[PDB]
Design a protein around this ligand. Structure first.
Ligand SMILES: Nc1ncnc2c1ncn2[C@@H]1O[C@H](COP(=O)(O)OP(=O)(O)O)[C@@H](O)[C@H]1O
Ligand SMILES: Nc1ncnc2c1ncn2[C@@H]1O[C@H](COP(=O)(O)OP(=O)(O)O)[C@@H](O)[C@H]1O
Lengths: 48, 447, 131, 108
């Protein structure tokens, strides 16, 4: 399926990915930032 | 990719009972060997199992129990287990026997304050209120002139209304220094104004001002709501005995003078009973008759024990839990009359006695373990066996109390966990009631 | 900074917040007119007067092209990537002169980790059908 | 103009001449507005100088399309199509050709 779907798209899709044209602008830093629930949140989450 | 993780707030502090989470009974009412933080005491826990069903049944008034047994047998731990077992919705009122000795009010009435405080009440209070920005304010004079009517314009995110009010509300608005462009709240029940702030629409009007600017209110100018109030009969008694509600100069100044207690007269308690019976008939109220717990009951004065004959026989009274750690004492205020648990025999008939008894060494090992993992510490098995040995040599509390000093020594000399050499060192740094009473009797010439 | 959220109720909570702290916010949302989607964009670029911009991922995250943002905060994660990635790349863009930090703000264990697990699973399964 | 955009046009032109449609699927921020405008800028043979097109788009984009048609090559006759029934009716009657693009959204 993968190679067939690739070969169907190859004649009529362009997809470069950023580094091939954004040659000199760097990637995003992604920060997965965790939080606890607050006391009222912990209670209402438990009530659910 | 990257992560961030934070939580700077300290925990609750570990207290001498905070491992107690419930009575640890099964659904048939039998005691589990150790559960919900408790260990052992099977008969005394199964007896408390009958009492927590007694409370939840609501049927009784003034039934009472005496947890009786040596120091360190867990009497206050079972009464705390009852407080956890009932949950927060039912009032458990903790009291100590020597708290009746007020200097503001009689001993024979401090007991009635606690008895009225242990009877909880849940009220479906409908409040009807006005809130908004004060867009207009005009008091009206009329002929004998005096101020007699008030016109107020209020505005919210849901448009605006003009309301017409009693001049006591204008005197309240004047007291709160309310002016046009303020945001206010007025419950029409109390007639109580709150100035919320100045409307945030005006926040640019000055370079420098003292005001809290606040966003314009939402929903209608005039609206009604039900508050599910939790309250106790004592809160009704005392609020009527020194009134701070309404908005006259008197209530406004009973809010300033020293808040002395007063010997509430039985006529007031009677009129409160009549009123709350009508809130119960109206379906506005649910009564939740709770528990009074008198720790150290053995030093209520004989005035108080003889009051409790009448108090425990009231058709109103809460269920009462007593604790005593004493043998055949002389009863306080009698000069020289002795009776079991330090309580007069005349009162001792009126209570179901729950005898509570000394632990085996195996129950001490098991409590010390459950306690150590609650104080948040790790302890090696030969060290805990040495604390169990100290339990046989001394008492449960001394054995438990070596845990946190041992953990302090463990982290100070760099370990993760308590080794036996830490407990064996701490045992020499800190004496106990039995071993101190040796050196203090040996050196008796010098104190 | 850009802030993205799903619930209009939550964007109202964040507007309540940035009225309270004096953060000079502005918002775009499903209720907003094309004349606001003109001007609110044109005033977030071309100015420094607007510290933060409040967005839906669906009404805001497509073609808006806010090159004057430096950072992005996902107050919500969507069940599907692409929507987040379009929303991120409308700060992280041809015409910037800076790094971009994208923050996802997530509750431990309760429910948002299930959304994030599907987002992780999708964000890999989505690759092999393209590259 | 940029070289990857011009090579995008030389790729699209063979699809157009074959009667084949295609996807500009590049990562976001790479100028699909510029590339889809450049259908006019880099095919000289009249169809792509005075022919009427239409753009359909998410509603937040309508003005950035209308702006970017002015910034790259302003020569093309562009019609907005957004806002009130009266305002869209006024413009609808213009196409009663000098309508080189209309800028639109899927609800309309
Ligand atoms: N059955 C028990 N299970 C668990 N902990 C207990 C138990 N009995 C006593 N304790 C604990 O040991 C200590 C002594 O009990 P306590 O209730 O304070 O005794 P006392 O009857 O003298 O007031 C407290 O820390 C208490 O929580
Ligand atoms: N030559 C150029 N000079 C300046 N900006 C350009 C140029 N080529 C492309 N751009 C930028 O392309 C951006 C439009 O990208 P867009 O079509 O929205 O990409 P996508 O749809 O993939 O996210 C605009 O911000 C525009 O300024």
């Amino acid at each position: 399926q993968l190679s067939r779907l690739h070969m169907i798209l190859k004649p009529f899709m362009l997809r470069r990915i950023k580094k091939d044209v954004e040659n000199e602008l760097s990637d995003k830093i992604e920060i997965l930032m965790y939080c606890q629930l607050t006391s009222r949140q912990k209670l209402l989450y438990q009530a659910l | 990719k990257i992560e961030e993780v934070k939580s700077t707030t300290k925990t609750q502090r570990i207290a001498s009972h905070s491992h107690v989470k419930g009575l640890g009974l099964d659904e048939s009412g039998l005691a589990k060997q150790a559960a919900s933080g408790l260990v052992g005491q099977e008969n005394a826990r199964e007896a408390c199992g009958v009492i927590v069903e007694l409370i939840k049944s609501k049927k009784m008034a003034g039934r009472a129990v005496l947890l009786a047994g040596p120091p360190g047998t867990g009497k206050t731990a079972l009464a705390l287990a009852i407080a956890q077992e009932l949950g927060s919705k039912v009032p458990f009122c903790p009291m100590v026997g020597s708290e009746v000795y007020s200097t503001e009010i009689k001993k024979t009435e401090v007991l009635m304050e606690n008895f009225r405080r242990a009877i909880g009440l849940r009220i479906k209070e409908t409040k009807e209120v006005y809130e908004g920005e004060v867009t207009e304010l005009t008091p009206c004079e009329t002929e004998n002139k005096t101020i007699s009517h008030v016109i107020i314009g209020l505005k919210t995110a849901k448009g605006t209304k003009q309301l017409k009010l009693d001049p006591s509300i204008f005197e309240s608005l004047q007291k709160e220094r309310v002016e046009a462009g303020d945001v206010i709240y007025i419950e029409a029940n109390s007639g109580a104004v709150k100035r919320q702030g100045r409307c945030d629409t005006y926040a640019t009007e000055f370079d420098l001002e003292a005001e809290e600017y606040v966003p314009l209110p939402k929903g209608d100018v005039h609206k009604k709501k039900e508050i599910i109030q939790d309250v106790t009969l004592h809160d009704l008694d005392v609020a009527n005995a020194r009134p701070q509600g309404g908005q006259d100069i008197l209530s406004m100044m009973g809010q300033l003078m020293k808040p002395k207690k007063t010997e509430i007269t039985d006529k007031l308690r009677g009129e409160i009973n009549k009123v709350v019976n009508k809130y119960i008939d109206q379906g506005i109220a649910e009564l939740v008759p709770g528990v009074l717990f008198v720790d150290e009951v053995h030093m209520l004065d004989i005035e108080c024990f003889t009051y409790l004959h009448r108090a425990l026989e009231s058709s109103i009274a809460p269920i009462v839990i007593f604790a005593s750690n004493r043998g055949n004492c002389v009863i306080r205020g009698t000069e020289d009359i002795t009776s079991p648990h330090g309580i007069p025999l005349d009162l001792l008939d009126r209570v179901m006695i729950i005898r509570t008894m000394l632990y085996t060494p195996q129950e001490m090992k098991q409590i010390i373990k459950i306690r150590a993992q609650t104080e948040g510490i790790n302890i090696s098995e030969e060290a805990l066996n040495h604390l169990g040995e100290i339990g046989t040599k001394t008492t449960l509390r001394y054995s438990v109390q070596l845990l946190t000093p041992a953990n302090l020594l463990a982290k100070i000399n760099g370990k993760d966990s308590i080794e036996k050499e830490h407990v064996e060192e701490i045992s020499e740094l800190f004496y106990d009631a039995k071993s101190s009473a040796k050196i203090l009797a040996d050196q008796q010439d010098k104190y | 900074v850009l802030i993205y959220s799903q619930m209009t109720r939550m964007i109202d909570l964040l507007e309540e917040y940035m009225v309270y702290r004096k953060h000079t916010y502005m918002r775009l949302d499903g209720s907003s007119k094309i004349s606001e989607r003109r001007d609110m964009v044109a005033d977030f670029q071309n100015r420094n007067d607007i510290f933060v911009f409040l967005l839906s991922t669906r009404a805001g995250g497509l073609g808006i092209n806010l090159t004057a943002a430096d950072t992005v905060i996902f107050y919500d994660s969507d069940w599907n990537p692409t929507v987040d990635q379009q929303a991120m790349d409308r700060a992280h863009r041809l015409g910037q002169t800076k790094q971009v930090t994208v923050y996802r703000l997530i509750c431990k264990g309760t429910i948002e980790e299930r959304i994030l697990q599907r987002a992780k699973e999708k964000s890999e399964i989505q690759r092999m059908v393209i590259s | 103009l940029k070289g990857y955009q011009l090579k995008g046009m030389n790729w699209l032109a063979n699809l157009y001449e074959q009667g084949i449609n295609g996807i500009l699927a590049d990562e976001m921020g790479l100028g699909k507005t510029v590339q889809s405008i450049a259908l006019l800028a880099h095919l000289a043979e009249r169809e792509n100088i005075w022919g009427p097109f239409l753009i359909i788009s998410p509603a937040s984009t309508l003005n950035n399309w209308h702006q970017e048609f002015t910034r790259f090559v302003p020569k093309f006759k562009v019609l907005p199509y957004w806002g009130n029934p009266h305002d869209r009716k006024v413009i609808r009657r213009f196409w009663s050709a000098p309508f080189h693009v209309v800028i639109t959204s899927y609800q309309l």
